[PDB]
Design a binder for this molecule. Structure first.
Ligand code: COH
Ligand code: COH
Ligand SMILES: *[C@@H]1O[C@H](CO)[C@@H](O[C@@H]2O[C@H](CO)[C@@H](O)[C@H](O)[C@H]2NC(C)=O)[C@H](O)[C@H]1NC(C)=O
Ligand SMILES: *[C@@H]1O[C@H](CO)[C@@H](O[C@@H]2O[C@H](CO)[C@@H](O)[C@H](O)[C@H]2NC(C)=O)[C@H](O)[C@H]1NC(C)=O
Ligand code: LM8
Ligand code: LM8
Ligand code: BOG
Ligand code: NAG
Ligand code: NAG
Ligand code: NAG
Ligand code: NAG
Lengths: 552, 552
């Protein structure tokens, strides 16, 4: 019945019903006017004609390597370009946040209730005739059918950008601090009330959990020593609740900030590294400040590790994923004379697009062994048997799977892929092409334009009939990749703005935080400003093994 | 022992210990350098030479009435000046917030824990030799002596700006949505987790309380009709928890958003008016949108009432308090091309300065009756006896007390004034002159300069010895007022930046919220942009009695 069901308002105009059979578009500050906000103002037509497409820009950033290495060696210029990268992404995210799974109009409940993931696009109204609004059939195609025909892996498809398992598990570990779906409430709800990079996955979401994980001496976290090596403490020692199957022995129930990180030894590898890093920064700070107590050493270390994480995520992780020859830079000062909101609300669509399970290999290869999924899950004895050094060496060599390009979801996690489809529908997501328009991308005009091939496209066409009815999540995994890239256009163009806010939106990047005294002085500040994935491993893993996010 | 105990860093430099008996000042972006950040950069010397004092600017704003009358009638000019008013206040508030009662250094706990009031100045460290740091005696003077000698009212001193009881109860009602101290935790903690103007004092702080207050028809709040007049519902009917003495009959236990508003009929008067306003706006919205459900009608009305509140607070309330001839303007668009953070954290010092109890008369005069405090408190039968119209007419006629200038705290609330003092100390507030420097005011050099007189000054000198040991709260109430004004310099220069962030920092003032469709279209938008204390009364009180925040 809802007259806004067909999504009539274009260019981020807002639709409002004005009766049972009429609507009105609010074109305020869109740059467009007219009934559906499709008539561009004069300056808008200029800006449209000038603005290059994301595929054009991507080409430039990934070619002319000779030029980029000149640019990278000129501080002033590199800073200027990075400033552009930061601000060109800015306009896409609503901050303060707006919609969520229950609210397709702005409300105080949607703004104030932090238990919701927010929504970049409002949900399709309950009384719309079709799942996408008015287009398509009364029901979407069978999710198991979509999954089997175009998502499940046949042969393992390796990532051509060379992403390795250090990368894959870093992605899983890093993102699971702000993707923490509260399944008791439903898929549109989160337990990550900090809505960003607060490192609750190391320190715990609550004060009570944090205090159970702390040593309360020298700012440090509790730990145990097994075979001369530092690991996290146990559940028995801390009374911290963790998720473990009943057959796991008490001595192998490791306690960390995030309750699910006992799921896979890969997560536990990173939890151990970051635990070691915290206590390392504690030693440095105590050295610098013998007059400091446990509480301040702890708090200042946590601020520094938040810094290191953002540093590493931008200059190593995102740097690898982007494929750019331009060297990204973590530098909060670049936004100080710009308009920017130092806040963030985690979007449901950010969670959804980040289900990068094709990354996972068919086996996990550590030293000379090849563990199946079944052997790998919930088995930290693997970590104890081989050690961190061997883990890093092995995972740095093992190639991860390609995410875009279709048919590369391992069958071991087919239930997760199927739920991504089912839960996206349950949360009433708009169509793929609605999300492309929301992020300034041209809508795809056929399934072949979407995939770049003919077989999966034909299968998708038999299932969905209309390209305007194609769904966001499956589309992301079948999209035509950029040339020799891990991702297609949609993943990058949706992911970048969400990411930007999560990283630069952190309070430590704001002017009142970004100064040496926040971090215990110039020594603490320098730990943030020199962090890299390589120094993280080198300082905290015996033998200082070489590491990287790509295979060699 | 802490080397930062003497507050050595000037001009908002941050102090950090570097050993047991050494410190370092972080002068980053202060405009100053050198050991205590007192050596001004070149651009700083210039801005210093140009920037006029607050007493000078205030003179200009409260004189040249003829000139202001020209300016007020030139839309472009009036807008431009309000823009400066808004932005000249910005640089004073930390946003994202920094300190709180437990953290004198920046930390994730202080940033993230919303149960704290934030702090404009860090607390004095526990191990400082004196309450103010290093100056003064081992203990501050007896709070009872300070209270009795310079705060307690002898004769009622009327406010020369003509503030009335409509103003006083509006102040109490409005501020008590974000000053809501959690006494179970301590004075530095709040129950107002929204930290601003969310109208939880009407709608309830929690969802469960909100649902108990709602009718779930037509977006409306529950109400009762007594003698043909609309009042809040009862505790018996709603199961909403309220604070009442045991002797209060069930028919008189009104249930409203804020649990303490049964305290005085003055608060209940405003609770009734806003209840009436919410349901009135529901009627208007239902007319515009017959297709809307209860939930959207409720949520949109709440957003509109948030809008009206901020409008009335700026253009009537702050307009009256300021004494300015320039006509202030509520217009979010004025900040859209400015750097500004749409967020707020309620400061402890803001709470402290807003204890405006000298406002209160010795008796409350309604029609021909005169109620004592004992007769007035927790007595809603007074509201029923006289009705809202008579309340408005009476409170519009009765003069309120002057707040600065000393000796005008009503004795009936002396226990509250003594607690303001004792709790400021318990929260380890820094000295008056420290807070003055923090807000770019010149420190006082004697008690006579503070008071502008000789008697109270001599009393204060015998108590405190050193002006640098004078405390913030008592100073506010004994301070020399502006000429025929209600407040002294310190009250205004501290209150304005806090107030600014609370009002303009609201999400509905952000670009993505500030458009007609947020408020149900142009009709809802207009309700916000035409609101006034007079229209609030006229739309909701029988007879449309004249009202004002000043006596006529
Ligand atoms: C960063 C990419 C990434 C990787 C490498 C990854 C690696 C793996 C992995 C191999 C070690 C296995 C067996 C799984 C299995 C799961 N993943 Co991921 N996942 C990943 C991205 C996600 C995201 C994003 C979610 C949603 C998390 C949420 O909402 O809480 C996720 C959720 C899941 C869930 C459901 C969450 C729940 O119900 O609590 C299962 C099961 N998984 N994942
Ligand atoms: C203009 C401001 C204003 C007015 C008119 C006002 C009018 C009155 C009034 C007149 C009938 C009476 C009997 C009181 C009595 C009190 N006020 Co005020 N108060 C006011 C500003 C405040 C502020 C600010 C606080 C602190 C509130 C908090 O933190 O909860 C306050 C707190 C109190 C408290 C302590 C609350 C507690 O301990 O939980 C009492 C008692 N009172 N107040
Ligand atoms: C945020 O929103 C959720 C969803 O409405 C609230 O959860 C509901 O809470 C009520 C009681 O307040 C329960 O009866 C419902 O069963 C809950 N629903 C779900 C889906 O969990 C939640 O309480 C809100 N949080 C806050 C702080 O207001
Ligand atoms: C915000 O800070 C307060 C003060 O530290 C926390 O309250 C304490 O919580 C501990 C552990 O839960 C209790 O044992 C104490 O009794 C509490 N103290 C006080 C003074 O209330 C509060 O839990 C924090 N909030 C969050 C979300 O972490
Ligand atoms: C300041 C630099 C950050 C801004 C990034 C903006 C643009 C970058 C360059 C370009 C491409 C990003 C690649 C993938 C998007 C998905 C997920 C991102 C993962 C990252 C995450 O999880 O946050
Ligand atoms: C956009 C306009 C708002 C900015 C105000 C900034 C400056 C105004 C003009 C000048 C003087 C304000 C007067 C008193 C300060 C105390 C309390 C204020 C009570 C108000 C409150 O409680 O918030
Ligand atoms: C792990 C694969 C499970 C497939 C079971 C369902 C069959 C539908 O998948 C079919 O299989 C082939 C895949 O190579 C493709 O050629 C067909 O296009 C596809 O329709
Ligand atoms: C856009 O406007 C045209 C006429 O201005 C109208 O026919 C059309 O239906 C509108 N769009 C949608 C999706 O309804
Ligand atoms: C757990 O890992 C060990 C290697 O340390 C392996 O021998 C064992 O089979 C694994 N357990 C399961 C149930 O797969
Ligand atoms: C300020 O610096 C001066 C020297 O510039 C020094 O003598 C003094 O001790 C410092 N201030 C304080 C409060 O110590
Ligand atoms: C309450 O107010 C009424 C006036 O309506 C008055 O008669 C009564 O005495 C008051 N009660 C108390 C306890 O003061």
């Amino acid at each position: 019945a809802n007259p806004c069901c067909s999504n009539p308002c274009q260019n981020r105009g807002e639709c409002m019903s004005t009766g049972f059979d009429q609507y009105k578009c609010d074109c305020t500050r869109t740059g467009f006017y007219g009934e559906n906000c499709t008539t561009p103002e004069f300056l808008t037509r200029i800006k449209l004609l000038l603005k290059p497409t994301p595929n054009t820009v991507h080409y430039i950033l990934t070619h002319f390597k000779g030029v980029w290495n000149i640019v990278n060696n000129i501080p002033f210029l590199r800073s200027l370009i990075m400033k552009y990268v930061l601000t060109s992404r800015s306009y896409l995210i609503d901050s303060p946040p707006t919609y969520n799974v229950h609210y397709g109009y702005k409300s105080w409940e949607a703004f104030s209730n932090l238990s919701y993931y927010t929504r970049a696009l409002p949900p399709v109204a309950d009384d719309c005739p079709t799942p996408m609004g008015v287009k398509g059939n009364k029901e979407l195609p069978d999710s198991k059918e979509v999954l089997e025909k175009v998502l499940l892996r046949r042969e393992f498809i390796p990532d051509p950008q060379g992403s390795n398992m250090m990368f894959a598990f870093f992605a899983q570990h890093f993102t699971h601090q702000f993707f923490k779906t509260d399944h008791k409430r439903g898929p549109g709800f989160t337990r990550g009330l900090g809505h960003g990079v607060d490192l609750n996955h190391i320190y715990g979401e609550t004060l009570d959990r944090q205090h159970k994980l702390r040593l309360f001496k020298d700012g440090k976290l509790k730990y145990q020593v097994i075979g001369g090596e530092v690991y996290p403490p146990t559940v028995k020692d801390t009374q911290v609740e963790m998720i473990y199957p009943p057959h796991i022995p008490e001595n192998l129930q490791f306690a960390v900030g995030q309750e699910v990180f006992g799921l896979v030894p890969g997560l536990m590898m990173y939890a151990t590294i970051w635990l070691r890093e915290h206590n390392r920064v504690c030693d440095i700070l105590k050295q610098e400040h013998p007059e400091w107590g446990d509480e301040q050493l702890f708090q200042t270390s946590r601020l520094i590790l938040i810094g290191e994480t953002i540093k590493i995520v931008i200059e190593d992780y995102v740097q690898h994923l982007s494929g750019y020859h331009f060297k990204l830079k973590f530098d909060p000062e670049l936004l100080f004379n710009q308009q920017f909101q130092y806040q963030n609300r985690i979007a449901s669509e950010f969670n959804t697009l980040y289900h990068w399970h094709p990354l996972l290999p068919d086996t996990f290869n550590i030293e000379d062994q090849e563990y199946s999924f079944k052997q790998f899950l919930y088995n930290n004895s693997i970590l104890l048997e081989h050690g961190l050094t061997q883990f890093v060496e092995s995972f740095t060599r093992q190639i991860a799977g390609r995410v875009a390009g279709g048919r590369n979801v391992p069958i071991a996690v087919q239930a997760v892929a199927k739920a991504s489809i089912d839960q996206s529908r349950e949360m009433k997501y708009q169509s793929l092409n609605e999300y492309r328009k929301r992020f300034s991308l041209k809508p795809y005009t056929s399934f072949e334009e979407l995939t770049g091939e003919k077989e999966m496209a034909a299968e998708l066409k038999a299932l969905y009939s209309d390209i305007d009815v194609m769904e966001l999540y499956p589309a992301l995994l079948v999209e035509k990749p950029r040339p020799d890239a891990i991702f297609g256009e949609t993943m990058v163009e949706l992911g970048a703005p969400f990411s930007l806010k999560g990283l630069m939106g952190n309070p430590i990047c704001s002017p009142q935080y970004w100064k040496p005294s926040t971090f215990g002085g110039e020594v603490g500040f320098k730990i943030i400003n020199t962090a890299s994935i390589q120094s993280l491993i080198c300082n905290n893993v015996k033998g200082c093994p070489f590491t990287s996010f790509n295979v060699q």
